[PDB]
Design an enzyme around this catalytic site. Structure first.
Site, mmCIF file in Angstrom:
data_model
loop_
_atom_site.group_PDB
_atom_site.id
_atom_site.type_symbol
_atom_site.label_atom_id
_atom_site.label_comp_id
_atom_site.label_asym_id
_atom_site.label_seq_id
_atom_site.Cartn_x
_atom_site.Cartn_y
_atom_site.Cartn_z
ATOM 1 C CD1 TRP A 72 -6.107 7.793 11.154
ATOM 2 C CD2 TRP A 72 -4.827 6.355 10.015
ATOM 3 N NE1 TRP A 72 -4.799 8.027 11.520
ATOM 4 C CE2 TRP A 72 -3.990 7.160 10.824
ATOM 5 C CE3 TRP A 72 -4.243 5.371 9.200
ATOM 6 C CZ2 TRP A 72 -2.605 7.006 10.849
ATOM 7 C CZ3 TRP A 72 -2.860 5.240 9.215
ATOM 8 C CH2 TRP A 72 -2.063 6.049 10.030
ATOM 9 C CG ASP B 140 -0.528 4.852 2.841
ATOM 10 O OD1 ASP B 140 -1.076 4.321 1.853
ATOM 11 O OD2 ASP B 140 -0.737 4.480 4.021
ATOM 12 C CE1 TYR C 72 -7.855 10.116 6.735
ATOM 13 C CE2 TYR C 72 -9.574 8.461 6.908
ATOM 14 C CZ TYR C 72 -8.250 8.804 6.672
ATOM 15 O OH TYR C 72 -7.314 7.829 6.375
ATOM 16 C CG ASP D 199 -1.695 1.270 1.400
ATOM 17 O OD1 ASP D 199 -2.410 1.648 0.464
ATOM 18 O OD2 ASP D 199 -1.615 1.891 2.482
ATOM 19 C CD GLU E 131 -0.675 10.887 4.035
ATOM 20 O OE1 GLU E 131 -0.789 11.886 4.769
ATOM 21 O OE2 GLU E 131 -1.014 9.739 4.397
#
Ligand code: NAG
Length: 383
Positions: free
Chosen positions: A343, A126, A196, A124, A128
């Site tokens: 999360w 991630d 979110y 995965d 950012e």
């Protein structure tokens, strides 16, 4: 069937008292996938463990990789993935790793070998966030080449192919600057939409961490900053609905109100006072909000955004609960998305330790397990 991933964080084991979270706090059927936050990277882009205690070790034993993957013995449908990145990781090393086919191959070969060694079923990403034309093309190449290498390794070994997923931005400006979605969609098994952190204590505008819909209580310029708009945006740009996994927070975000008499969404504040266990100003865990409600905080329901907030003196918290999770699961099912991810595991009341708990383990995440999985998570205590 619905995809129901949950993030495990390997530093929650270091929280105090009731907040200590270890893999053995998991309960079967709660998730279909556990994403291990996080795997890590060397300067040369090869993969390493984030925490030495992830690996078998002298001071704590089996290691958190094996303890997470051992959950598959008693939860036989569960799959696991190793997640790379996160906010604290920043972008500098990703930008270097993704810069060329050579540098991407170093990471890709290392990561595939690494997850096979430690028993994970997928990788995965991630990052950012990728941003700009160079990052956008390099990110497409990274995901394309990672999937290609996973197909090659599967074909060569006869093993089931590793999954390739990513946690991705929910904000339109960030999405447009970094993600070429039609050229990413074919190469992802699914994406974890980070729907979110829409509003938070980085600004003075008080609003909701994860509103399902917009509210007219906030200025019109924000009416696209919500779960619904973000999920639709990814679909409109080319991501199939079955690959969009809607993000569900078990933490909340909070302010110290500038004016304790002005308590409506859209008011103004500075960061909330630090909470006992999460130890990050403006962030709090569900198992802390449950105590605030037991200590005199007033719960309000925002009927437009379909999320709660609470007020305790000059403290104002946006959070999620069973009712907001229910509205959101109805939305996922009604609109046909692929599932919902959490999360984190460790911010729910994972051990039913809230002083007002009726005994339900994972009061929040069990709503997802029930509404998308048909799974009943038990109460704590004797059975
Ligand atoms: C505080 O908020 C209340 C209610 O919105 C308002 O009537 C009052 O004028 C505010 N006080 C200040 C100093 O802004």
């Amino acid at each position: 069937s619905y995809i129901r991933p949950c993030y495990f964080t390997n530093w929650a084991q270091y929280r105090q008292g009731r907040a200590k979270f270890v893999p053995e706090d998991y309960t079967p059927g709660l998730c279909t996938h556990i994403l291990f936050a996080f795997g890590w990277m060397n300067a040369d882009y090869t993969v390493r463990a984030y925490d030495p205690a992830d690996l078998p070790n002298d001071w704590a034993g089996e290691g958190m990789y094996r303890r997470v993957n051992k959950l598959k013995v008693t939860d036989t449908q569960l799959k696991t993935l190793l997640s790379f990145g996160g906010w604290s990781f920043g972008t500098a090393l990703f930008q270097g790793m993704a810069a060329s086919s050579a540098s991407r191959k170093v990471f890709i070969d290392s990561a595939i070998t690494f997850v096979r060694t430690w028993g994970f079923d997928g990788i995965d990403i991630d990052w950012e966030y990728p941003s700009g034309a160079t990052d956008m093309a390099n990110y497409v190449a990274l995901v394309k080449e990672l999937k290609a290498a996973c197909e090659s390794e599967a074909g060569s070994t006869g093993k089931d192919r590793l999954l390739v997923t990513a946690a991705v931005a929910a904000g339109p400006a960030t999405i447009d600057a970094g993600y070429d979605i039609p050229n990413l969609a074919p190469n992802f098994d699914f994406i974890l939409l980070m729907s979110y952190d829409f509003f938070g204590a980085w600004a003075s505008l008080v609003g909701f961490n994860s509103p399902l819909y917009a509210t007219t209580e906030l200025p019109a310029e924000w009416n696209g900053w919500n779960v619904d708009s973000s999920a639709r945006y990814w679909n409109q740009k080319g991501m199939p609905k079955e690959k969009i996994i809607v993000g569900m927070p078990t933490y909340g975000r909070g302010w110290t109100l500038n004016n304790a008499s002005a308590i409506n969404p859209g008011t103004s504040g500075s960061p909330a006072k630090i909470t006992q266990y999460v130890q990050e100003a403006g962030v709090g865990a569900y198992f802390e909000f449950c105590e605030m409600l037991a200590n005199g905080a007033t719960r309000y329901w925002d009927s437009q955004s379909q999320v709660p907030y609470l007020v305790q003196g000059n403290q104002w918290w946006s959070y999620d609960d069973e009712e907001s999770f229910a509205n959101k699961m109805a939305y996922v099912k009604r609109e046909g998305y692929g599932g919902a991810f959490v999360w984190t595991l460790d911010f729910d009341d994972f051990n039913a330790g809230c002083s007002n708990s009726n005994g339900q383990l994972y009061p929040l995440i069990s709503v997802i397990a029930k509404e998308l999985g048909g799974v009943i998570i038990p109460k704590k205590g004797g059975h």
